[PDB]
Amino acid sequence: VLSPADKTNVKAAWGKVGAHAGEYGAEALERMFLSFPTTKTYFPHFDLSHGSAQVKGHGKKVADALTNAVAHVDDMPNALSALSDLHAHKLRVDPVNFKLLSHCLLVTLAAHLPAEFTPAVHASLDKFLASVSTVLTSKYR
């Protein structure tokens, strides 16, 4: 569960992302494909090459789902139910992969927000992502 400071921390860290969310989503993705090649098994129909816009296109989508979750930090389950419906029933992504992407996102953020990526902010973001991941896999069975 997100505490008031978790929320505050994620509203502010994400706030700074501002503009690059999509840019950042894309990189998180590239970081995941590369470090955790097993993750590529879900994106067989994609171009997984540096700068593919399939990846850029996908990145932005991810980042907007996160922006939305942030915006409804107080009602995440409802805010992303559509997205859980989808991952649960159509994509059927092994839950373990949510943890790998989340990590790549944390790596991406730390790489772009030197100044705001504090222990406190790091902790908050990690919990945030895990709750996002939890929401997303809630309808698997």
Partner 1 sequence: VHLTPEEKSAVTALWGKVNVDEVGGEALGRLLVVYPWTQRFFESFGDLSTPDAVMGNPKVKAHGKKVLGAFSDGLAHLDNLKGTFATLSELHCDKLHVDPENFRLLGNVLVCVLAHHFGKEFTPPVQAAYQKVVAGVANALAHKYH
The length of the chain in residues reads: 141
**Whether the Cβ atoms of residue 58 and residue 26 lie closer than 8 Å to each other:** yes
Name which position in 5, 12, 53, 91 contacts ligand HEM (CB under 6 A).
91
Buried b (16+ CB within 10 A) or exposed e, 72-94: ebeebeebbeebbeebbeeeebe
Using rule CB under 6 A, residue 132 touches ligand HEM? yes
- Provide, rounded to whole angstroms, the least separation between the CB of residue 69 and partner 1: 19
Q: Does 127 bind a second copy (CB under 8 A)?
A: yes
**Residue closer to a second copy (CB basis): 50 or 141:** 141
Residues 19 and 139: their CA atoms lie apart, in Å, by: 32
| Contact set with ligand HEM (CB under 6 A) | 39, 42-43, 58, 61-62, 65-66, 83, 87, 91, 93, 97-98, 101, 132-133, 136
